[PDB]
Amino acid sequence: ALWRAQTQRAVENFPISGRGLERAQIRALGLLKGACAQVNMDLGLLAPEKAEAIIAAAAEIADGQHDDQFPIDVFQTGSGTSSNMNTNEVIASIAGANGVAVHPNDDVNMSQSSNDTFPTATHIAATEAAVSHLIPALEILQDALATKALEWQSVVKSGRTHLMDAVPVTLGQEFSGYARQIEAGIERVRATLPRLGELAIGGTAVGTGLNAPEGFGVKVVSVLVSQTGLPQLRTAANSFEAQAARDGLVEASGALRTIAVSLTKIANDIRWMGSGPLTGLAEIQLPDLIMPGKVNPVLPEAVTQVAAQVIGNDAAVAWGGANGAFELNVYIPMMARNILESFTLLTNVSKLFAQRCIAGLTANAEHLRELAESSPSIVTPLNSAIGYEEAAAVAKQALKERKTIRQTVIDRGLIGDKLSLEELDRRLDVLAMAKVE
Amino acid sequence: RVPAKALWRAQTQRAVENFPISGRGLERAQIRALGLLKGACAQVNMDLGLLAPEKAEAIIAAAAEIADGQHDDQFPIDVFQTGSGTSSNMNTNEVIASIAGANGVAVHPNDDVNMSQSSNDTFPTATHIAATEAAVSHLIPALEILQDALATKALEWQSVVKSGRTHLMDAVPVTLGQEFSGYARQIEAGIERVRATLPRLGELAIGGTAVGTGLNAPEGFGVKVVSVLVSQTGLPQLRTAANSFEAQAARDGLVEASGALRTIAVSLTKIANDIRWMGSGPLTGLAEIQLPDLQPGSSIMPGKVNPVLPEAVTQVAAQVIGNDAAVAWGGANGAFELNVYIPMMARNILESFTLLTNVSKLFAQRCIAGLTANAEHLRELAESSPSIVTPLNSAIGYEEAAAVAKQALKERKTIRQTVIDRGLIGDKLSLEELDRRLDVLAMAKVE
Amino acid sequence: VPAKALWRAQTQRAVENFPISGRGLERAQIRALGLLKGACAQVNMDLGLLAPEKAEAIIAAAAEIADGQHDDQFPIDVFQTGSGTSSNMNTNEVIASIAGANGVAVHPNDDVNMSQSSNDTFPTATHIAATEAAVSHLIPALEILQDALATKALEWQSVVKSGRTHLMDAVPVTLGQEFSGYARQIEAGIERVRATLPRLGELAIGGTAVGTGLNAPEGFGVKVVSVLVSQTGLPQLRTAANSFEAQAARDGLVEASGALRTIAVSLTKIANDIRWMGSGPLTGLAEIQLPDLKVNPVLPEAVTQVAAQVIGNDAAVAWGGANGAFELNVYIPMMARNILESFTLLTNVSKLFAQRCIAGLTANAEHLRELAESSPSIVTPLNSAIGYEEAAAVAKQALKERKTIRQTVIDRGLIGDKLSLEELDRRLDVLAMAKVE
Amino acid sequence: RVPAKALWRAQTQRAVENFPISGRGLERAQIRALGLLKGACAQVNMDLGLLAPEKAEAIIAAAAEIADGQHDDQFPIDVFQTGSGTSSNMNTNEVIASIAGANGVAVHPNDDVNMSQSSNDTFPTATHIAATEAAVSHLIPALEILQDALATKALEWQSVVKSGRTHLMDAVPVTLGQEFSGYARQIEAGIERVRATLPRLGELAIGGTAVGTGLNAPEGFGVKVVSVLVSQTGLPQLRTAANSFEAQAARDGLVEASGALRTIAVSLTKIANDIRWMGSGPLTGLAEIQLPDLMPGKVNPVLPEAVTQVAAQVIGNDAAVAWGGANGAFELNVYIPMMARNILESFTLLTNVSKLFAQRCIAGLTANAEHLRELAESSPSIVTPLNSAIGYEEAAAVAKQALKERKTIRQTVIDRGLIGDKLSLEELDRRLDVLAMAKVE
């Protein structure tokens, strides 16, 4: 039981959601307090006994030893002051228990304000989320899809446009498109990093840096980069923008929202291809997670639900981001919750979708080819041999009798001087029609 | 392999391994609703001679423990699970079977605990029970607390005249009471909006079984179960669905109810924003009212209170708006006989109910109730506005009235003092007539 | 100022100040402004505040506007001052010009705007227009759609097919049952719109600048509303419950937009099912045929795109709604644009969808029944005669040979002492399994 | 039955009758992109020897009239049409065929004007052309104008000290210049955000034909058409798609670009809200700055209201784009006309309002500098540097007395008799130097 009077009052003030800061947020706050103590010691402003104790307490917090010591609601003062002081109070208690007296404000918060610390910890968490969690999970997903694209490179089937019969494509081509959407997702997350990684630390109460030592922010960021291995962390381009607004969070959520849109398409196609068997498309078999197989598309359902959550969370992030006033945007804890949750859900579901659905998909190449070979969409190359009228009669009879176009052309007595069997086979070569590269 | 204290079994444990996505499971209220439903189903199956009394009574007793919140640690499955909520349905069946078994009665999770049921009709039923209970027993009473606090303050401030603001610019007089009666109306209308959703929010799918047809459930199963649920919850809002296909193919009642919560979020944002603006400064702001200090510390400095409750309220509203977008997205995307976005939709709507309930009460009791106004002063300020010179026109002419306005601003004085200063009291008008014409409380036209 | 222009100086300035979208008010918004100005002139006359000669010229000019004779006289951008003052003045100026050309001098502010402020006039016209749109346009179009769906539900009451849950094969239903579900969604949409009318019909008129009624006669609003009800035949129009709430907020528009948003969600499901039912034919479900306008499902596409627009419009309305300050919400023209567009799009596409898609659908009943009679989903009723192990084997062989369950039971030599042909047909009666009520 | 002056034909008239939904057709920029595309296709088909030069040149000339805005009245089909935009594609082919015929050359709308193209790779190409042009040639230049206006104020007001505000409550000093530098950065970052979407916004589907495979287009048709488009538009951002299937099965590039516009809306909401608050009152508000005007003065903040309403529209439009984007199926996303409407409108609104806001509001702002500095010098926030001279007790007593009497800290220190051997006037003025507290870099 390590927090003190201030945190206790915040517990009483905000019984709203019953949920507090997440592991990554507590980690970031610990990392930040350690870096600030280090710099304050480097500069000779904080006595080494005090600093080394703070640095040790902060390392415990960062390592996840005191997650039970952060009871404050997400829905707290919009600067995150409550959680800032929560971290200061906890560090002080730990230091004192190791027989070193430090003041939560004067020592643990030395050279800092809430207004620059809580957004810094938020951006450390979000940058770490993008770089060390989500991008690698997206690469796992891109690789699974790309591997399918290769495996199925020659697996010809019918295209569908407007949900209607269309000319041939391969499953490999379609899956290459999904792989590109996830590759583009990775490009989209990376494109946000130059601004997501900007940190407010050193701007103090209003962005001017008053009561912080010269270059405090530069030095803290330097320590943070070396401790996290994230070179994307950087001092803000403009100290006022970095505290008056959280636009980088709005930007990064936009990339996550685009990824949610891509995943909705990929997952929807996958459950449709797996549908039926009798009542559906029965094109592929999904891994099952006395009687015939009927696998529910549970992972596609989890993906599409996660995407809806990201859409909603993204709307909440933008709403908070728009509503800053003057020197401070006071929607930080709510914005932090939503973007970090979006990173988490997308990271975790992308890996599961790749590994326990995509990877083990199967298809019947022989059957899918025989079906593409049955489509009215492929009769066009016959027009110059048999005329538009016979071609339409062929298409009708093929559908009615449930035969291939080839077989119907044979059945209707069209093989002869104007159309040989080998010419028929050439003009109706559905794999060639897919134009595989 | 299952933990030793665990009352769940193999199907639940598989779902734990399949969906490690958010790390969050069903809320207390959803678990309670699953318990209530399973008890009521066992009661009806027993009533109808379909389930032997020894089995049914053990299931009913076990389901009551769940409903009473004794087993909230027995529901480990992620929110982001199969979209019908089958995993959570099975979780409930397994936990009930374990409880029954530990009491010496063997029951089958599917054949007995799920008798006459599907997951497709059970999970959306439990969802609508929880949402209806949230609206009726939690949110409406919290909104009533907030409405009453706003209305009490409006009466207290009935004669506290100040300048209106339109476009953020100086306007004619209003009272703080009048503005607060407007806030109270927004909350009163919020309650009306939630009540208007109840006829459809309260519809339950139970009895529709796998596809809405009621196949493999006894005739009138749904009607009988709903009757038991109404008796046990005291919620007469719970009813059988008007159409059994609509009630499974869609979750449109959740979308509708979320829309009401979204409107309330919009109202709360306006109310909270005004109150923190009125509290702003003191020196750089409007300094119209003082908010209760929720963070006092030892100090010999002038007071400066942060508007932490309006910040909590406005952040809650943002969350409700996001949650509402999430609900609508899941709601649109059903296919054929089943909408498979249920656990995600349930999570978002029930959270919006919880956040609004909790923050409305806090806002009412720890912010609204103790607001104070700077009143003799708000009045001096309204008495200084160029907005109030119009009623002088018919005594002194609009050109002199305009000069009065300009001089008042320049010398930072009341309109009244400026009229006196310019020597107009005499033949043009008496002091009593001036005071009648410039009575700013009267200009507010309090009803 | 253009020669044929009936607007004057203030309007031409607004034209120059807001070249933003290049779109002005819609016909319905212009009409409502005309109705309002007519009603105000009538009341001011009744009260002896406005000379009859002036009032009658204003009344006649306002009626021309209400009748759509001057839809070209309102050039101001939607994106104008957020009270809609510019459009208010635009109306006053146009009326003055019409009166003038009929030989009667009236002052746009002192006469046409007598007893009024822009702050109570523009939202009043907005709510008149939205109430009119709901009652006289949308609900009648939804009724046409509900009737078309219900008609199909009846026509197809015995058209048995397999259900689909998770997109996977399920026990029998009828096309008629599914359409009854669609009809209920639309019936419920009508209830939803009706439920918003008590607050959508609330009008701010009489509240003047800040909601107090300063500079309007006692009971001005009630008297104006009385005239409006009498002219429009809309009993839903009413004075606001609270005059401050009615000007400080536009919550009734947020509420009404929420009902439109729910209808958009319902229409998305209905249109999606219909285009899937009509898909293929070869590569899809081939359940029904859509009227031609292999037909692409162009009306389901128009419906789903309209619903997307309504979702977006609704987000804009809520954003405006939350952001009022003190005595006035200044997002009215934008909010009005979006809600009124959503009414119009839903009205027009609902009628088209009903009359040019739903009404002419045809069902492929034999293909539907054949599939249902071939489903492993229907073997359960055989258990009590042949055992679940044999029932499983029937299901497997039926799938392998593409035969009905019935024929498979015969083919496996099960008819005789185990069960008779009559008993087999009773147990496998798929229409009976749908349990039509 | 078709109107007399109409250059469209039967397929377009059927579309007019089929989709009477919104009553609104394509915008000028969309019609222009369709003409540009058709001209480029005819050029390439002629280059490849597939289209006779007389036909191709007639098509090229017609398409140029369309690209030049000469026939924006010939496109009557509703936005809410078939979701591939096939109807508008056919509308373009028919209008071109009519123009060619009026100029004495017979061409077939399908066989000639649509040669090598399909009903599914044309409309998304024209959409991405229009969106790329809008981003590069219209929006970014307008944001640069706004950035410059804000940056100019940041410099002009670099010494205009005032009190900071956090949580809406009094805070330590800043300058108006510093606050405006924050706004300028938001707009500069908004330009960075738009630029960041260009590698994917500029990808074009042309050449993929019906399903993305390029069936029935000549080898390299896409590459060749893109080269002509680049030369004609001067937009090197136009490029062939990385993956031809992704470019038709999805419109993810539009969702991405809409996200950047949404962020700009979020930034503009903050800047406009601050500006109208600064201009508020005069008596009831903050009265920090005076806005240009578009009895005593009381200017309504009309441009901040226009900006915040535009921002709301962009937010709604952005939701519509994402909803359409998510809902493709298999080889084609069929929400193209609706997505195009919304993203292109968001570009147009932000372009026009940004320029107006910059030139007709920001440029002419004036600051109440005396009142601002005097207020900063009156703040309890600035007494901390007195602690070491007069002690905590008197520093606090000074803050209280200053507020009560509506005086500066400086005058209150004098009034309390605190000037002596522990504190000179020169030292008092150093310690209470509010501009120095703003630490202007």
Locate the chain D residue with the closest alpha carbon to C323. D308
User: What number of H helices and E strands is found in chain A?
Assistant: 17, 6
Return d(Cα C224, Cα C43) in angstroms, integer: 6
For residue A207, which of D385, D181, D269, D187 has the smallest C-alpha distance? D181
H or E element, residue B317: helix B308-332
Question: Integer distance in angstroms from the first to the last C-alpha of chain A?
Answer: 64
> Beta strands D289-290 and A164-170: pairing type?
unpaired
Return d(Cα C210, Cα C216) in angstroms, integer: 12
Question: Integer distance in angstroms from the first to the last C-alpha of chain C?
Answer: 68
Active-site hit among C70, C127, C137, C166 = C166
> Beta strands C202-203 and C238-239: pairing type?
parallel
Number of C-beta neighbours around residue B108 at 10 A: 13
Return d(Cα D2, Cα D13) in angstroms, integer: 7
List alpha helices for B234-251, DSSP H.
Answer: 246-249
Return d(Cα C47, Cα B198) in angstroms, integer: 45
Cβ-Cβ contacts under 8 Å, A311 against chain D: 322
> Does residue C70 carry a catalytic annotation?
no
Backbone angles phi, psi at B212, to 5 degrees: 105, -10
DSSP C72: T
At B181, list the tokens: 């009666």
Q: Output the CA–CA distances (angstroms, integers) from residue D7 to B230, D13, D57, D100, in the order listed.
A: 67, 11, 18, 10
Return d(Cα C210, Cα C214) in angstroms, integer: 8
Return d(Cα D405, Cα D403) in angstroms, integer: 6
3-state secondary structure of B25: coil
For residue A79, which of D183, D166, B281 has the smallest C-alpha distance? D166
Chains that touch B (3 or more CB pairs under 8 A): A, C, D
Q: Do residue B270 and residue C249 have CB atoms under 8 angstroms apart? A: yes
Q: Which residue has the tokens 């109810």?
A: B257
At C122, list the tokens: 């523009």
**Which contacts of C153-156 are long-range, i.e. CB under 8 A and separated by 24 or more positions?**
C153/C177, C153/C179, C153/C180, C153/C182, C153/C183, C156/C363
H or E element, residue D168: none
Number of C-beta neighbours around residue B103 at 10 A: 11
Q: In one letter, which amino acid is B337?
A: E
Q: In one letter, which amino acid is D296?
A: P
The rounded Cα A105 to chain-centroid distance in angstroms is 37
Return d(Cα C362, Cα C374) in angstroms, integer: 22
User: What number of H helices and E strands is found in chain D?
Assistant: 17, 6
Nearest to A290 among C278, C371, C392 (CB): C392
Q: Output the CA–CA distances (angstroms, integers) from residue A61 to A22, A31, C90, in the order listed.
A: 12, 8, 64
Please return the burial class of C340, using the count of CB atoms within 10 Å of its CB with bins 0-12, 13-18 and 19+.
buried
Per DSSP, the residues of A160-221 read EETTEEEEEEEHHHHHHHHHHHHHHHHHHHHHHHHHHTEE-TT-TTTSS-TTS-TTHHHHHH
H or E element, residue D311: helix D302-326
Beta strands, E only, B361-444: 372-373
**C-beta separation of B305 from B291 below 8 A:** yes
Residue B304 in marked binding region: yes
H or E element, residue D212: none
Q: Which residues pair with C325 in a beta bridge?
A: C328
Return d(Cα A88, Cα B204) in angstroms, integer: 50
Task: Count Cα atoms within 13 angstroms, Cβ side, for B366.
Answer: 21
Contacts of B359 (CB under 8 A, 6+ apart): A16, A75, B268, B312, B313, B316
> Which residue, among C161, C179, C191, C210, would best test binding to B if mutated, counting the most B CBs under 10 Å from its CB?
C210
Return d(Cα A31, Cα C95) in angstroms, integer: 69
How many angstroms away from the CA of A296 is the closest CA of chain C? 6
3-state secondary structure of A323: coil
Return d(Cα B421, Cα B152) in angstroms, integer: 41
**C-beta separation of D287 from D368 below 8 A:** yes
Cβ-Cβ contacts under 8 Å, C375 against chain A: 278-279
DSSP A4: -
Catalytic residue IDs of D:
167
**C-beta separation of B327 from B345 below 8 A:** yes
List alpha helices for A275-403, DSSP H.
Answer: 298-322, 332-353, 365-372, 383-401
For residue D323, which of D241, D232, D254 has the smallest C-alpha distance? D254
At B146, list the tokens: 């907030």
Q: Which residues pair with D173 in a beta bridge?
A: D163
Which experimental method was this entry solved with? X-ray
List alpha helices for C278-380, DSSP H.
Answer: 298-322, 332-353, 365-372
At A429, list the tokens: 């070569």
Angle at C91 between CA C86 and CA C94, to 5 degrees: 120
Q: Do residue D210 and residue A159 have CB atoms under 8 angstroms apart? A: yes
Q: How many beta-carbon pairs below 8 A join chains A and B?
A: 137
Return d(Cα C355, Cα C237) in angstroms, integer: 31
Question: Integer distance in angstroms from the first to the last C-alpha of chain B?
Answer: 72
Per DSSP, the residues of D332-376 read B---HHHHHHHHHHHHHHHHHHHHHHIIIIITT-EE-HHHHHHHH
Nearest to C185 among B252, B321, B390 (CB): B252
For residue A367, which of A160, A171, A177, A167 has the smallest C-alpha distance? A171
Return d(Cα C249, Cα C246) in angstroms, integer: 6
At A302, list the tokens: 């989890």
Q: How many beta-carbon pairs below 8 A join chains C and D?
A: 130
At A430, list the tokens: 């559905």
Q: Which residues pair with B161 in a beta bridge?
A: B175
Locate the chain A residue with the closest alpha carbon to B319. A316
Return d(Cα A436, Cα A10) in angstroms, integer: 63
Task: Count Cα atoms within 13 angstroms, Cβ side, for A383.
Answer: 6
Q: Do residue D22 and residue C345 have CB atoms under 8 angstroms apart? A: yes
Q: In one letter, which amino acid is B201?
A: L
Return d(Cα A397, Cα A376) in angstroms, integer: 10
H or E element, residue C244: none
Q: In one letter, which amino acid is C135?
A: V
Q: Which residue has the tokens 């009859």?
A: C52
H or E element, residue B171: strand B169-175
Q: Do residue C79 and residue D310 have CB atoms under 8 angstroms apart? A: yes
Cβ-Cβ contacts under 8 Å, D309 against chain C: 79, 82, 320, 331, 333-334
The rounded Cα D379 to chain-centroid distance in angstroms is 39
Return d(Cα D127, Cα D254) in angstroms, integer: 9
Return d(Cα B423, Cα B402) in angstroms, integer: 15
Contacts of A39 (CB under 8 A, 6+ apart): A111, A216, A219, A220, A223
What does the radius of gyration of chain B's CA atoms come to, in whole angstroms? 30
What is the SS3 string spanning D191-207? HHHHHHHHHHHCEECCC
- Length reported for chain A: 437
> Beta strands B203-204 and B239-240: pairing type?
parallel
3-state secondary structure of B335: strand
Return d(Cα A81, Cα A113) in angstroms, integer: 9
Return d(Cα A346, Cα A310) in angstroms, integer: 8
List alpha helices for D208-251, DSSP H.
Answer: 221-233, 246-249
> Beta strands B239-240 and D289-290: pairing type?
unpaired
How many angstroms away from the CA of D18 is the closest CA of chain C? 7
Any idea of the CA torsion for A248, A252, A258, A261, to the nearest 10 degrees? -120
Q: Do residue A374 and residue C167 have CB atoms under 8 angstroms apart? A: no
Asked, as a colleague might, if the bond just before B3 is cis with ω within 30 of 0, I would say: no
Q: Which residue has the tokens 């419906």?
A: C303
Number of C-beta neighbours around residue B245 at 10 A: 28
For residue A357, which of A295, A312, A411 has the smallest C-alpha distance? A295
**C-beta separation of D162 from D174 below 8 A:** yes
**C-beta separation of B29 from B66 below 8 A:** no
Return d(Cα C117, Cα C210) in angstroms, integer: 9
At B357, list the tokens: 């309930």
Task: Count Cα atoms within 13 angstroms, Cβ side, for B250.
Answer: 38
**C-beta separation of D332 from D249 below 8 A:** yes
Q: Which residue has the tokens 């009270």?
A: C83
Cβ-Cβ contacts under 8 Å, B322 against chain A: 312-317, 319, 338
How many angstroms away from the CA of B311 is the closest CA of chain C? 15
Helix B28-47 to helix B53-67 angle (10° resolution) is: 160
Q: In one letter, which amino acid is A41?
A: M
Number of C-beta neighbours around residue B100 at 10 A: 25
Resolution (A): 1.9
> Which residue, among B119, B165, B216, B263, would best test binding to C if mutated, counting the most C CBs under 10 Å from its CB?
B263
**C-beta separation of D350 from D139 below 8 A:** yes
Cβ-Cβ contacts under 8 Å, B308 against chain A: 13, 76-77
Cβ-Cβ contacts under 8 Å, D345 against chain C: 21
Q: Do residue D345 and residue C21 have CB atoms under 8 angstroms apart? A: yes
Residues in chain D after which the backbone breaks (C–N beyond 2.5 Å): 294
Backbone angles phi, psi at C368, to 5 degrees: -65, -50
**C-beta separation of C246 from C207 below 8 A:** yes
Contacts of A25 (CB under 8 A, 6+ apart): A83, A121, A122, A125, A336, A340
Structural domains in chain B?
1-117 (1.10.275.10), 118-387 (1.20.200.10), 388-443 (1.10.40.30)
